[PDB]
C-alpha cells in the first residue's frame, strides 16, 4: 500500500478555529488580532504535524525547530489557499470557519494587495487541477524549502530529507502517467507553483514585521509565540540571512 501517502493523510491537521466575533463590525485592529491568534493556534498544529512527518526526526533537534520557524508562513498560506479552493472555490480567503475574508475584509485588513496574491494562489489549485495528494506532498516539501545561507547544524541530513520528498512528489506524478512527457510537464507545473509561494510569504513577512513594530500604536495584539518568531526569526529572512530554495531561477 501507499505508505508515504498513508502517513501524510493520517497526520494532516483538522480544522482550526480563530475565535473571531463575527457579530462585531469589521475593523483593522479586530481582524488582525484575530489573524494573529489564528497564527498562534495554527503554529501548535504545524509543530505537531511537522514532528510526525516521515524522516523528520533524522534532523538535528535545533534544525527541526529552525525549519518550522522559517517555513510556517509559506506552509500556512499554502494550506489556507487549499482550504479556500475546496470550500469556496477561491471566491474568498478561508482563513478559518469563523474567519472568512470577503473583499470588504481584505480592504479593512489593510492587506488587500497581499490578499490578492493569496487568492491568486488559491485559484491555481483549480486552474492546475491539483489533487488532494499532490497538495499533501507539496505542502510537506514547503517545510524543507527555506534555510540559512550559511547552512543548518547538520545540513547533510536536511539535504537527504529534501531529496526524498522531491522523489515522493515525482512518484505521485507518475502513479497515473505512462508517457514521460506528461510527467515532466506536471513536475514543471508543480515546482513552478511551489516557487510562487515564496514571494507571497515574503510580502506577508514584511507586513507582519512592520505591524509588530507598530503594534502598540494601532491596537493590534500579538500572542507570545508570534511576537517571538516575528522579532527573532522573520528578520533573518528579511535581512537575507535565511533564504528560500527555488526550483527555477527567478
Ligand atoms: C502574520 C499574520 C497572522 C497569521 C496569518 C498571516 C496571513 C496568512 C495566515 C494564514 C492562515 O490560515 C493562518 C494565519 C496566518 C499565518 C497574517 C499576516 C499579518 C498577520 O500578522
Rounded distance from Cα 234 to ligand 1 centre (Å): 13
Residue tagged 488582525 (cell numbers): 32
**Residue of 13, 20, 76 to test ligand 1 pocket, by largest number of atoms within 8 Å of CB:** 76
User: Does ligand 1 have an atom closer than 6 angstroms to the CB of 93?
Assistant: no
Grid cell 540559512 in the structure block, residue: 148
Experimental method: X-ray
| Domain annotation for the chain: domains and CATH numbers | 1-250 (1.10.565.10)
- Cβ of 39 below 6 Å from ligand 1: yes
Q: How far apart are the first and last CA of the chain?
A: 38
Q: What is the DSSP letter of 150?
A: T
| DSSP code for 25 | P
Tell me how far apart the 2 most distant CA atoms of the chain are, in Å: 59
Q: Is 129 left (phi over 0), alpha (psi -120 to 50) or beta?
A: left
Dihedral angle computed from the Cα positions of residues 223, 225, 228 and 230, in that order, rounded to the nearest 10 degrees: -80
* Rounded-to-integer distance, Cα 108 and Cα 218, Å: 13
> E strand or H helix at 153, and its extent?
none
CA distances from residue 45 to 1, 12, 17, 124, 135 in whole angstroms, order as listed: 27, 9, 11, 25, 18
218: part of which helix (H) or strand (E)? none
C-alpha cell at 173: 506524478
- Among 39, 208, 213, which residue has the most ligand 1 atoms within 8 Å of its CB, making it the best to mutate? 39
Q: Is 36 among the annotated ligand-binding positions?
A: yes
Q: Is 22 annotated as a binding residue?
A: no
Q: How far apart are CA 237 and CA 244, in angstroms?
A: 9
- The helix/strand/coil state of 238 is helix
CB 40 within 8 A of CB 224: yes
Going by CA atoms, what residue is nearest to atom 14 of ligand 1?
Answer: 39
Three-state secondary-structure class, residue 43: helix
Say which residues have a Cβ less than 8 Å from residue 85's Cβ, sequence separation at least 6.
122, 123, 125, 126
Ramachandran angles phi, psi of 29, nearest 5°: -55, -50
How remote is the CA of residue 190 from the centroid of ligand 1, in Å?
24
| Cβ proximity of 52 and 86 under 8 Å | no
154 is in an annotated binding site: no
Burial 68-85 (b: 16+ CB within 10 A, else e): bbbbbbbbbbbbbbbbbb
Amino acid at each position: 500500500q501507499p505508505i508515504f501517502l498513508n502517513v501524510l493523510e493520517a497526520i494532516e491537521p483538522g480544522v482550526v478555529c480563530a475565535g473571531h466575533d463575527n457579530n462585531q463590525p469589521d475593523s483593522f485592529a479586530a481582524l488582525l488580532s484575530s489573524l494573529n491568534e489564528l497564527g498562534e493556534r495554527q503554529l501548535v498544529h504545524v509543530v505537531k504535524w511537522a514532528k510526525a512527518l516521515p524522516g523528520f526526526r533524522n534532523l538535528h533537534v535545533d534544525d527541526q525547530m529552525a525549519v518550522i520557524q522559517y517555513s510556517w508562513m509559506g506552509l500556512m498560506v499554502f494550506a489556507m489557499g487549499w482550504r479556500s479552493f475546496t470550500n469556496v472555490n477561491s471566491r474568498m480567503l478561508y482563513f478559518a470557519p469563523d474567519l472568512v475574508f470577503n473583499e470588504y475584509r481584505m480592504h479593512k485588513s489593510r492587506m488587500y494587495s497581499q490578499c490578492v496574491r493569496m487568492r491568486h494562489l488559491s485559484q491555481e489549485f483549480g486552474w492546475l487541477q491539483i489533487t488532494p495528494q499532490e497538495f499533501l506532498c507539496m505542502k510537506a516539501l514547503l517545510l524543507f524549502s527555506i534555510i540559512p545561507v550559511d547552512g543548518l547544524k547538520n545540513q547533510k541530513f536536511f539535504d537527504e530529507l529534501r531529496m526524498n520528498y522531491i522523489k515522493e512528489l515525482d512518484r505521485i506524478i507518475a502513479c497515473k502517467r505512462k508517457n514521460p512527457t506528461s510527467c515532466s510537464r506536471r513536475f514543471y507545473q508543480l515546482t513552478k507553483l511551489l516557487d510562487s509561494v515564496q514571494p507571497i510569504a515574503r510580502e506577508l513577512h514584511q507586513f507582519t514585521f512592520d505591524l509588530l513594530i507598530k503594534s502598540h500604536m494601532v491596537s493590534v495584539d500579538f500572542p507570545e509565540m508570534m511576537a517571538e518568531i516575528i522579532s527573532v526569526q522573520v528578520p533573518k529572512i528579511l535581512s537575507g540571512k535565511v533564504k528560500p530554495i527555488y526550483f527555477h531561477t527567478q
